[PDB]
Amino acid sequence: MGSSEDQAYRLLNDYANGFMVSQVLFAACELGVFDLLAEAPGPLDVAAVAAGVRASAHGTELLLDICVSLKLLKVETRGGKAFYRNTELSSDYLTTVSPTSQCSMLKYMGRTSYRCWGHLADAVREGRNQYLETFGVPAEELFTAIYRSEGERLQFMQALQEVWSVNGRSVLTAFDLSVFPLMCDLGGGAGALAKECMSLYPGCKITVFDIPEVVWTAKQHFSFEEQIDFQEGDFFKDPLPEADLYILARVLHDWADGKCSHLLERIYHTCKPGGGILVIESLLDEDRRGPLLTQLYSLNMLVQTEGQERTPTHYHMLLSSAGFRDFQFKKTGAIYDAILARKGT
Amino acid sequence: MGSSEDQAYRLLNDYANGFMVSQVLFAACELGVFDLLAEAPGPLDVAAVAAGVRASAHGTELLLDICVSLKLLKVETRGGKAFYRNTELSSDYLTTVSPTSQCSMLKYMGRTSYRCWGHLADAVREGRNQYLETFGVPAEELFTAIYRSEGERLQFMQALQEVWSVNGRSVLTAFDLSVFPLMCDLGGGAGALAKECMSLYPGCKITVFDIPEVVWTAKQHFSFEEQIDFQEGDFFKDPLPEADLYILARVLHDWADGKCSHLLERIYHTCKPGGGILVIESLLDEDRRGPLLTQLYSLNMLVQTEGQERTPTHYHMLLSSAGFRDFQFKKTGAIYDAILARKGT
Numbered sequence: 203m204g205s206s207e208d209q210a211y212r213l214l215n216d217y218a219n220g221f222m223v224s225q226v227l228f229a230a231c232e233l234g235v236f237d238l239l240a241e242a243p244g245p246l247d248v249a250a251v252a253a254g255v256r257a258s259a260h261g262t263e264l265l266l267d268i269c270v271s272l273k274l275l276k277v278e279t280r281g282g283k284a285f286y287r288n289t290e291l292s293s294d295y296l297t298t299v300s301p302t303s304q305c306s307m308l309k310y311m312g313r314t315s316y317r318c319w320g321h322l323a324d325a326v327r328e329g330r331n332q333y334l335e336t337f338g339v340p341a342e343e344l345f346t347a348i349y350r351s352e353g354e355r356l357q358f359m360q361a362l363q364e365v366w367s368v369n370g371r372s373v374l375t376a377f378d379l380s381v382f383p384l385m386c387d388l389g390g391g392a393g394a395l396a397k398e399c400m401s402l403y404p405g406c407k408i409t410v411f412d413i414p415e416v417v418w419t420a421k422q423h424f425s426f427e428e429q430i431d432f433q434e435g436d437f438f439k440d441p442l443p444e445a446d447l448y449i450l451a452r453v454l455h456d457w458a459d460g461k462c463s464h465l466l467e468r469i470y471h472t473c474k475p476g477g478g479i480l481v482i483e484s485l486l487d488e489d490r491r492g493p494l495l496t497q498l499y500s501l502n503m504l505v506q507t508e509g510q511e512r513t514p515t516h517y518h519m520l521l522s523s524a525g526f527r528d529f530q531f532k533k534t535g536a537i538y539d540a541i542l543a544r545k546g547t
Numbered sequence: 548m549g550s551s552e553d554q555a556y557r558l559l560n561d562y563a564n565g566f567m568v569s570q571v572l573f574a575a576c577e578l579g580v581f582d583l584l585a586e587a588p589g590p591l592d593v594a595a596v597a598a599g600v601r602a603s604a605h606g607t608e609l610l611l612d613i614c615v616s617l618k619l620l621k622v623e624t625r626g627g628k629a630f631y632r633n634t635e636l637s638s639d640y641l642t643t644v645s646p647t648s649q650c651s652m653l654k655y656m657g658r659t660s661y662r663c664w665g666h667l668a669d670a671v672r673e674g675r676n677q678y679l680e681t682f683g684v685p686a687e688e689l690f691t692a693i694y695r696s697e698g699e700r701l702q703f704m705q706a707l708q709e710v711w712s713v714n715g716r717s718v719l720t721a722f723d724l725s726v727f728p729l730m731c732d733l734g735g736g737a738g739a740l741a742k743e744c745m746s747l748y749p750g751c752k753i754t755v756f757d758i759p760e761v762v763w764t765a766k767q768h769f770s771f772e773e774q775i776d777f778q779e780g781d782f783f784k785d786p787l788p789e790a791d792l793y794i795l796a797r798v799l800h801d802w803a804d805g806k807c808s809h810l811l812e813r814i815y816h817t818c819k820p821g822g823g824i825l826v827i828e829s830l831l832d833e834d835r836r837g838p839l840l841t842q843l844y845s846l847n848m849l850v851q852t853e854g855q856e857r858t859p860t861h862y863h864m865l866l867s868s869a870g871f872r873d874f875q876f877k878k879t880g881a882i883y884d885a886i887l888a889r890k891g892t
């Protein structure tokens with residue numbers, strides 16, 4: 203990718219070099235270079251950043267300089283010295299104090315997904331995930347592999363909640379959910395989406411439903427409101443909480459059609475006339491050929507779960523088969539879209 | 548990176564998702580999807596590609612669809628079926644038969660560099676490479692870690708030669724080398740650059756100098772011309788071949804200043820009045836803040852070797868200290884640039 207070379211060659215190098223750019227961003231997060239800059243009295247030199255993050259003078263310099271070129275950081279010259287500062291981008295998304303922080307998700311991508319992706323050819327060859335070949339941990343029970351340790355589980359929970367600080371409003375306000383006074387977030391993790399949901403619908407109440415170890419770490423690590431309640435269990439076998447609306451955010455994409463049909467049938471059979479199901483997923487274009495981000499997300503499900511990303515028609519087949527009617531969707535213009543279907547008589 | 552969201556958020560996801568895009572390209576190469584399409588009588592459906600590469604129908608489909616979105620492949624509809632074909636880009640750079648093939652380099656990046664990069668935070672913290680923490684192999688002798696096995700050595704040799712099919716002419720014709728009838732490529736690997744050099748300068752002769760195991764695999768795996776000769780040895784201790792011009796392509800970037808000064812002093816002391824040194828490296832902008840590709844390449848030297856990328860001034864310091872004069876450089880507009888310096892009286 204030399205300035206004077208063929209557009210195709212330049213594009214090819216961009217693609218090839220993508221993993222280096224991803225890891226510069228992940229490493230900057232992992233070392234906390236953005237937080238140190240936000241906690242600083244002004245801009246910092248290379249020696250200061252290096253000292254404050256316990257890293258090399260040579261290593262730090264290179265990292266800061268790439269961040270500047272990537273427009274993650276800004277640099278100013280004072281005397282014979284470069285001083286670094288945050289951008290609008292890093293302040294809004296790469297600072298732990300920021301409410302729209304994307305830090306934890308980026309750290310998970312670099313420590314977890316990145317490794318899995320190193321075995322992509324094999325996942326493509328086998329049509330299955332690579333936890334065993336990557337971490338030496340079996341995935342016969344998906345979430346035993348995903349929650350490898352207490353540490354891994356917390357990181358996963360901190361990671362996933364972050365998108366809702368930017369995407370939450372569009373998915374919950376796509377349809378008017380004020381018709382469902384009592385709600386249940388099936389596989390709600392730490393309860394970030396339910397916390398968002400409760401501020402938008404003040405006349406509602408919600409129960410966050412997840413596996414016992416998740417419910418425990420949620421109560422133990424994430425602070426709590428008056429409208430949010432918890433229930434531990436397995437949604438494939440246990441009695442589900444009574445609700446007018448069951449929310450399924452990034453649950454269906456973890457599983458194959460059959461497993462999906464099973465959970466959907468259980469929810470249907472628990473619903474009452476007029477009850478609803480709100481599926482929050484990144485919708486794939488009808489020709490499965492876009493959006494590129496969603497396509498990459500489907501391949502990550504090949505590598506990280508037992509599922510895939512799906513087209514609106516595919517969700518309609520699944521939901522119709524379970525017994526739901528009045529299927530509707532809304533493309534938000536964001537990663538995450540919203541589907542609402544209902545139970546009749 | 549939803550179409551309707553903030554430019555900064557979209558850019559952040561691009562960066563974050565870069566490793567997925569890199570591995571889609573590496574995996575496509577590793578499975579030989581481009582070669583199968585070039586060897587096909589026409590365009591192929593998903594079932595055909597899947598069968599021809601021994602992979603999943605689901606896995607293959609996703610890979611082909613991402614390649615189409617990345618503009619690596621083109622798709623056409625016939626009946627109720629997608630048929631895939633190569634682009635100008637994949638035909639020129641991703642086909643093993645093509646002379647400008649970049650396949651081997653991409654395979655090395657995905658199998659070798661990609662893994663090393665997973666330990667970037669640590670390389671930045673320690674200021675040293677990660678062969679031990681990645682492959683469990685010590686790097687106290689750099690090239691013993693780089694040539695982990697017979698297999699790894701061949702892959703490295705096939706990988707590195709590829710850039711010269713696009714960049715070779717600019718580096719060898721930057722200066723008129725017809726003044727040096729007898730040449731030596733120090734650390735010339737398989738001899739791709741020397742083969743390029745011999746077609747450009749028909750009145751010249753060249754000796755490719757590398758470590759015994761490299762010289763062996765070069766004679767054993769790469770086919771040979773009448774102007775090219777080989778010499779095995781260690782350029783830090785052994786008698787160098789007699790030449791009017793010593794070529795150092797991507798050698799100096801592997802080592803620290805001191806080691807560089809040592810080899811440079813040896814070459815200087817072997818040269819005769821009017822003799823020359825041709826350093827072929829990716830030059831860093833004077834403020835070390837670009838080009839981005841070169842910056843990423845310097846960080847890869849932190850992770851993969853004992854060196855870094857350097858600015859023209861830095862090469863001038865090194866070459867002047869060794870005794871060379873008449874320092875000149877030429878930015879080609881490509882990844883690889885050229886430096887020429889001379890020995891006086």
Ligand SMILES: C[S@@+](CC[C@H](N)C(=O)[O-])C[C@H]1O[C@@H](n2cnc3c(N)ncnc32)[C@H](O)[C@@H]1O
Binds near residue numbers: 389435438451
């Ligand atoms: C992909 S995460 C999504 C979390 C959250 N809804 C979001 O989008 O951020 C899937 C959730 O389903 C939970 N889960 C998986 N299997 C479950 C089961 N059998 N019963 C209850 N919860 C389960 C996991 O613990 C995890 O919180």
Ligand SMILES: C[S@@+](CC[C@H](N)C(=O)[O-])C[C@H]1O[C@@H](n2cnc3c(N)ncnc32)[C@H](O)[C@@H]1O
Binds near residue numbers: 735781801
């Ligand atoms: C980065 S590779 C570059 C190969 C080639 N010049 C190119 O740019 O494609 C560095 C070369 O130096 C060789 N090398 C490393 N140490 C050496 C030594 N002490 N003596 C001779 N060759 C050496 C390696 O075997 C390798 O071929």
Ligand SMILES: CC(=O)NCCc1c[nH]c2ccc(O)cc12
Binds near residue numbers: 362498499
């Ligand atoms: C890249 C991507 O798939 N992001 C979505 C969030 C995410 C990352 N890893 C996961 C594993 C399971 C899951 O249900 C969601 C995620």
Ligand SMILES: CC(=O)NCCc1c[nH]c2ccc(O)cc12
Binds near residue numbers: 660798800843851852
């Ligand atoms: C990404 C990059 O640094 N490309 C340059 C070619 C290349 C890849 N790995 C290497 C290790 C040592 C070296 O001397 C050159 C390379």
Ligand SMILES: [Zn+2]
Binds near residue numbers: 467
């Ligand atoms: Zn039923």
Ligand SMILES: [Zn+2]
Binds near residue numbers: 812816869870
């Ligand atoms: Zn000397």
